[PDB]
Write a protein that holds these residues in place. Sequence first.
Motif: not given
Lengths: 52, 304, 97, 48, 98
Positions: C56-57, C59, C62-64
């Motif tokens: 999540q921190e 990737a 900017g992919c959630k």
Amino acid sequence: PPGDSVTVSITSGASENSCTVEKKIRRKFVGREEYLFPPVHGKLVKCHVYDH
Amino acid sequence: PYLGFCPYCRHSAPCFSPIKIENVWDESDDGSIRIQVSAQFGYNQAGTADVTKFRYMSFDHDHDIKEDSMDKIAISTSGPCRRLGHKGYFLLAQCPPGDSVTVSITSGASENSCTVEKKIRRKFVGREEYLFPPVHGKLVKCHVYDHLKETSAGYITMHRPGPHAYKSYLEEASGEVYIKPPSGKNVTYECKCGDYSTGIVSTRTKMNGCTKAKQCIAYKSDQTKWVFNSPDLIRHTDHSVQGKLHIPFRLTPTVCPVPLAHTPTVTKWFKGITLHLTATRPTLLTTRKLGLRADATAEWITGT
Amino acid sequence: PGAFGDIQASSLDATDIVARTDIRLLKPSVKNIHVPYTQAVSGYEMWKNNSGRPLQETAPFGCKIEVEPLRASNCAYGHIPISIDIPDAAFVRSSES
Amino acid sequence: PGAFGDIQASSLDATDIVARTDIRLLKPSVKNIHVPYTQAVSGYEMWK
Amino acid sequence: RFHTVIPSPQVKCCGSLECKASSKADYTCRVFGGVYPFMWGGAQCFCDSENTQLSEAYVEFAPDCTIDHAVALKVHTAALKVGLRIVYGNTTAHLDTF
């Protein structure tokens, strides 16, 4: 237990008299591995202790 | 309500105690720890439910079940702990940081305590260190042990008790061996002074052909009990699964409050930013680019 | 032993658990009854300490990242060629516009 | 804020105390009455 | 986390034992010679020698793994799905497409 000073106190009712003296009491072990307490299983090595 | 072989008794050296700690769990995020010991809590001699008192095995040759009260239980790692719950073999208590955990019964001057090494650290939930849950802050997902005593985290298997020989049952006189069962209790005895010989006796009984006390053994047929699959007991010949206790205090999810750090001060400059940061405790900062390369950077920051 | 996945199973309730933890039994020395054993530390805890930051921190683009099911939402990258059959009803002829 | 002289005055008892410590109020969230806030650490302590 | 469960040891009091072949996780069984163990009454057997003991141990899942566990997966080619809002003239439309 480990501590930076040692204190001896008498409590005669409400009259408490305690003397404290600085002494770096540290936790020491015998052998080549640290341990909090002497385990149930392990080697028996030579040590020196104050006779009770 | 068996007794284990505690590595650290009250005085120092290992010895057999009714309150041996078998397992300790600290997976909850609120610092509460679940402890397992041999003694039975919430019950009396007959096993009837009661919060006021617990049971254990006596320190005598009859080893019947004796009883005591909750107020005489003490749990401590470095300072005194707060007892949150108790059920069967299990306790749940919130404790301060420490390297070992100790459970003790104070029967007057008899302070029978068992200590076991366990590095209990102060843990938190979120991205910010703290000592206490802050009054104001974000609500995040956490997992804490349920204080309800009737929950279930799993199960523990128990089996029928095995033989537990006694020398008090045996008597040496004139180079001859005798068995003295307790009054009104049938005792299975077995010996080998030549031919191997078993049997059951119920009174003061002679045996022939034996000269030394070590060569025989005797124990009462105590099938009226159950014992956890502990490594400190001798198991019965038929060690089949004969019971399953629940593990109370399930680790349930809930919402925990976590603090919000001081808002950063951002100063802009040509293709770049400067975050002035203030955090009295270690706060996590994680930055990443939104292009082909993340260039992810993570850092725990203290002070200003 | 001593690393991630030292104990594995198809499910939590699966009874066909397979593990290799380097557990070994030693001779009992002290008079009192006990079974001594030395075993390698749990590799799950070792990975947990050295897990590193999650995806999540880290990737890119900017992919959630999200779970249940595993997915990456609001992930900005590339171009989408789109061919669309817009209906002729919405169209207005130039003679009236 | 966060530096020496983050609070200044002509005297200890002077009423013309001037401060810029970068204090910001936050919206309350819990049911009970309380006012939350955040503030930069004392720059005097940092200099000390 | 694995819970290293240790079954209660057995002793063939004046005979011999042989290690069986169970199918538990990381099952480990060993046989030791004469031990002459003590429980609380100063003796458990009558033969100082030939008093073998069976040490048994294996591992299971800890009671708290139902929450504290990690799942291992392998990924394959990923399909990208898009939620899309498009407006033409007067008409707007929301659509989810692959």
